[PDB]
Design a protein around this ligand. Structure first.
Ligand SMILES: NC(=O)c1ccc[n+]([C@@H]2O[C@H](COP(=O)([O-])OP(=O)(O)OC[C@H]3O[C@@H](n4cnc5c(N)ncnc54)[C@H](OP(=O)(O)O)[C@@H]3O)[C@@H](O)[C@H]2O)c1
Ligand SMILES: NC(=O)c1ccc[n+]([C@@H]2O[C@H](COP(=O)([O-])OP(=O)(O)OC[C@H]3O[C@@H](n4cnc5c(N)ncnc54)[C@H](OP(=O)(O)O)[C@@H]3O)[C@@H](O)[C@H]2O)c1
Lengths: 292, 295
């Protein structure tokens, strides 16, 4: 089994390193702040002191830093670049499809194979069967080294050959996540302003989460089939949503909780109603997301 | 199956409550502004009152389930009804605001009635099932004295405190979580359409990652309850990498002419947290910046 290098030992870079070690890979790590990489030494990692050293130790280089601008400062420096020849670079950093494409062109021009990924996981999911990572780029590199990706999670998937696909789907899945989390921020604010124990909110969310998961799956299934008009299988219709949402708005007004996000919800509800969708399926709101 | 229960409102949800009281063997008295809508409950064993005042006089417990609190007011504050509320337990299960709950608590007490305010977190189908969820707030004694009645409405009926507005507030909060996930869905769909991604693919990715999102939300609630805004060893994610990736979604929505009213809201909260030193704190730190930037 070949040696794997990991550039970045933040929360997520460390989790990747831990999973490689658990699977019995010689794992070489590097981090701008060397102090943060020590605990992986304790676990069996070799700590490289320099990028160039980490790149020379291994045939596969998994990058997990803040952004592609950072990855550039690391890999595009004169004293690293010549070391990339013959290597597989796996950019698991978050980015834009353009960034994936720009990095694909550049890595190829300097003699290295490339995969661009997006980790659809928190660190606790890495190295578990449920662990999801999306990979895009040439198929051969993923097929030749499949056991390495299998170490990272049971649901690491090659989803296409155009490098930017992982980053594109990622932005969509992150939009879902941000939606749920800022709804959390709204709920937490409402409970704090109304003197509601947040441990109670946490019990209420554990009870309703599975229903809300179904409401979101149904919204996607219906939008894919154009089924915007309410029917017998409708779970969620615009009228009752819009009606109850008035109560949340009134509460947030009274407690001076910021309404910029909910006023956003309200503008989408109102465009759909102004177009006769008041008793249509929630999925009809998918027609009213555009700028103008 | 001992005391008599009246239900005002036989709409979709009012009916389900009445059906569940009958299933449990309660003498059930119903009334509806549209008489015709209450007939099917007669066939099931309900006595149909012709007037509100008659429905209120028949029973010691009055469950109200109408459209809005303005409606409840019309019904209960009428000269011919009000004096009949003396010694009654009124259980307002209509959806409303915490202020509405509070205004009704004050008023009901002034006219000599005990009060509970509720919010139903269930569709009519799940009323009278073990899963059936209803939140109640107000004085505890009335709930504890009549607990078998609430058990009839569902297995997961809960008294959550003494301040009457808690039920309506917790309801709005649970729905804010739901709306957050759904409008996130609307955003994700829109991004897929603009990038020519099969929505069947988004649907498979959601089945794969829903638990990751569910854990992020649970963790955000647990940490906010303990004030843990500083990033630590147990942190799942922190503000800097969130704000970094969120830049890519903003740029994409600009380029594909997707409406940004909602994400610009996210962006203002990210900015206030960073301006106050939380760039590398836990996501939970954003919870400190949900207040109106005003005054
Ligand atoms: N955490 C999650 O749940 C999650 C989910 C999926 C994807 N991701 C993505 O994975 C990446 C890592 O996130 P994380 O949670 O691990 O964040 P983090 O804990 O803040 O880790 C940041 C990492 O980037 C490095 N870095 C920052 N600026 C750099 C620069 N100019 N040059 C070199 N290295 C630099 C840090 O080095 P120092 O330690 O030297 O500062 C560290 O290795 C991000 O793109 C994130 O969006 C995160
Ligand atoms: N359906 C659900 O799944 C669900 C779930 C949770 C919460 N809820 C809440 O339950 C409550 C009842 O809604 P629903 O689903 O039963 O709605 P619905 O089917 O529209 O029933 C509306 C009811 O309100 C009555 N009403 C409205 N205005 C009135 C007035 N001014 N005077 C007298 N009666 C009046 C109606 O009388 P008419 O029959 O004469 O119009 C009818 O009984 C709402 O607050 C709703 O938010 C419903």
């Amino acid at each position: 089994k070949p040696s794997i290098s990991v550039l970045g030992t933040g929360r997520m870079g460390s989790a990747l390193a831990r999973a490689l070690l658990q699977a019995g890979y010689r794992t070489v790590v590097w981090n701008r702040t060397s102090e943060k990489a020590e605990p992986l030494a304790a676990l069996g990692a070799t700590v490289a002191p320099t990028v160039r050293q980490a790149i020379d130790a291994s045939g596969i280089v998994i990058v997990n830093v803040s952004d592609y601008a950072a990855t550039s400062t690391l890999l595009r420096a004169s004293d690293v670049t010549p070391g990339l020849r013959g290597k597989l670079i796996v950019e698991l950093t978050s980015g834009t499809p353009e960034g994936a494409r720009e990095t694909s062109q550049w890595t190829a021009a300097h003699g290295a194979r490339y995969l661009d990924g997006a980790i659809l996981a928190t660190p606790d999911f890495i190295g578990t069967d449920a662990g999801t990572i999306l990979l895009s780029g040439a198929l051969e590199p993923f097929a030749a080294n499949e056991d390495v990706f299998r170490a990272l999670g049971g649901n690491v998937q090659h989803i296409g050959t155009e490098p930017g696909l992982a980053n594109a789907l990622d932005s969509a899945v992150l939009a879902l996540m941000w939606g749920a989390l800022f709804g959390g921020l709204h709920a937490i604010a409402v409970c704090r302003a109304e003197e509601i124990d947040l441990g109670e909110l946490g019990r209420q969310w554990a009870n309703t989460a599975p229903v809300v998961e179904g409401l979101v799956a149904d919204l996607i299934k219906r939008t894919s089939a154009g089924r915007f008009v309410s029917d017998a299988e409708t779970l969620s219709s615009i009228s009752p949503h819009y009606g109850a949402f008035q109560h949340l708005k009134e509460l947030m007004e009274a407690r001076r909780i910021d309404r910029t996000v909910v006023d956003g919800y309200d503008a989408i509800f109102r465009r759909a109603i102004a177009s006769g969708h008041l008793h249509d399926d929630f999925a009809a709101l998918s027609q009213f997301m555009g700028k103008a």
